[PDB]
């Protein structure tokens, strides 16, 4: 809900 990691997005 702001960038995650290689697989999960936020």
């Amino acid at each position: 809900x702001x960038f995650x990691n290689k697989y999960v997005a936020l």
Side-chain angles (χ1 to χ4, degrees):
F3 56 86
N5 60 61
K6 190 182 288 185
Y7 309 123
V8 140
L10 242 298

